[PDB]
Amino acid sequence: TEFKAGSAKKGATLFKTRCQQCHTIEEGGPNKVGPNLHGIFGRHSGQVKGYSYTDANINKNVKWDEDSMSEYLTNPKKYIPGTKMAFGGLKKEKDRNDLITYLKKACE
Amino acid sequence: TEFKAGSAKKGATLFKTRCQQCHTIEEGGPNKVGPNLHGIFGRHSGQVKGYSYTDANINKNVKWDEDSMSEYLTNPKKYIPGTKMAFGGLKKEKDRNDLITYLKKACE
Ligand code: HEC
Ligand code: HEC
Structure with a gap:
């Protein structure tokens, strides 16, 4: 494919607003609805x-x-x-770019 | 009209990514391209x-x-x-909601 880096600050808020409900991302954070x-x-x-x-x-x-x-x-x-996983998805690439940006940084 | 509150964290990143280029928002921040x-x-x-x-x-x-x-x-x-002001605009209500959310908090 092709994937470009967007914004890690934006990716951050998307996480808090879309994923955090079910997932933690920090080293040693607990498993919840999601791993x-x-x-x-x-x-x-x-x-x-x-x-x-x-x-x-x-x-x-x-x-x-x-x-x-x-x-x-x-x-x-x-x-x-x-x-x-009960999430419809992120339809915009822009949206996914930002988010994967953040994830890549935060997951390491 | 009708305006609903969205997210102040999201509104925050939108600002940083769309407005901050030309505007400051803090009490006593400088005028720049924009006031x-x-x-x-x-x-x-x-x-x-x-x-x-x-x-x-x-x-x-x-x-x-x-x-x-x-x-x-x-x-x-x-x-x-x-x-x-050279900005095309924020086409999505959702987007404007989040942002005005943040602004309302941050501008006071
Ligand atoms: C609760 C309503 C969820 C939200 C919102 C998001 N996820 Fe999720 N996720 C959830 C469940 C119940 C599961 C397990 C699926 C299963 O069949 O076992 C998952 C799984 C993932 C994975 C898989 C990781 C693995 O170890 O295989 C990933 C990468 C993941 N979820 C990411 C993720 C992101 C980035 C989200 C926000 C947009 C997100 N999920 C939302 C529950 C929920
Ligand atoms: C630079 C490329 C800009 C960006 C990005 C944004 N704004 Fe702007 N803004 C800019 C200028 C040059 C001006 C002055 C217009 C004039 O004709 O004098 C403005 C003005 C505003 C105002 C008017 C406030 C007033 O005191 O009347 C507002 C409320 C404003 N700008 C808000 C704003 C927001 C929230 C932005 C991000 C989405 C934004 N602007 C982008 C320059 C630029």
Whole structure:
């Protein structure tokens, strides 16, 4: 594909307003409705310890990158049918760019 | 009209990313390409001291409120023909809501 960096401040607010409801992102933050996402780009789907994932996400075995991430957030279920993440998606690239910007920084 | 409160954190990033280029908002911040906007909702257009406004904005005599503001940011020049603010506008209400949210808080 093609992915460009947007704004990490903007990505920050999007997170707080769209993801934080179900996820933490900090090193050592708790699993909640969703799994903790710290360190995600160095991992594959369904590997956070103690988190109960659907068969769907485990089997998908997604190696998370800025590119897999942009497609996933477009529409989570289209990408991972069976997934229990209840989020419609981020339709705008601009939106996904900003957010993945932040994630990439914050997840490391 | 009708104006609803969105997010002040989101409004914050929008500012930094869309307005800050030309405006400061803090009490005692400097005039720049644009006038300082601290205290704007208690004022009419073209009254900041030392700022050189166009005849256009002065004559318009806009009493700035969440409602005049939402329409202005839709398209500044459509609202104030002759105005020298070079910004296309914020097409989404959602976007304007967030931003006016922040402004209202930050401008006081
Ligand atoms: C609650 C309503 C959620 C919101 C809002 C978001 N996510 Fe989510 N996420 C949620 C669940 C229940 C799950 C588990 C899915 C399963 O089938 O097990 C997830 C999963 C993810 C993942 C997968 C990571 C992995 O370890 O495989 C990612 C990358 C993820 N969520 C990211 C994410 C972002 C960035 C969000 C905000 C736009 C977001 N999710 C929203 C629950 C919820
Ligand atoms: C520089 C490219 C600008 C950006 C980006 C934004 N504004 Fe602006 N603004 C700018 C100028 C040059 C002017 C003066 C217009 C004139 O004709 O004199 C303005 C003016 C305003 C006003 C009017 C306030 C007054 O005292 O009458 C407001 C409320 C305002 N600007 C707000 C504002 C916001 C919220 C912005 C971000 C989306 C924004 N402007 C962008 C220059 C520039």
